[PDB]
């Protein structure tokens, strides 16, 4: 993930000082989609279709 | 960077190629705690 952030245009410094908060942001991003497995997820709708 | 037994040494990204370390195969980079450090076998 860190090297990915380096590639996409985020410098080594800010990721080197903000590991945990971006980690928690990644975690809540992954968790929010869990309960969203409904009509709001268009791909879920397309699979049901 | 792969260490042999005949030392850390350069190899290509697609073959097990044993080669020494020069400046013509690497770039510079910022400090980072997440890797290794040497004090006597210094690459040029
Ligand atoms: C130098 O490399 C060692 C081995 O990985 C590491 O433990 C150490 O933290 C590095 N030095 C610095 C200043 O990060």
From TrEMBL, chain A:
Lineage: superkingdom: Viruses
Protein name: Spike protein S2'
Encoding gene (name): S
Region (Heptad repeat 1): 19-49
Organism of this sequence: Human betacoronavirus 2c (isolate EMC/2012)
Parent sequence residues shown: 976 to 1024 of 1353
């Amino acid at each position: 993930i860190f090297y990915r952030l380096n590639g996409v245009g985020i410098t080594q410094q800010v990721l080197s000082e903000n590991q945990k908060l971006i980690a928690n942001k990644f975690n809540q991003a992954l968790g929010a989609m869990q309960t969203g497995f409904t009509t709001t997820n268009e791909a879920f709708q397309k699979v049901q279709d | 960077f792969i260490k042999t037994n005949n030392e850390w040494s350069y190899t290509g990204s697609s073959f097990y190629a044993p080669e020494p370390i020069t400046s013509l195969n690497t770039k510079y980079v910022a400090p980072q705690v997440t890797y290794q450090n040497i004090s006597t076998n210094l690459p040029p």
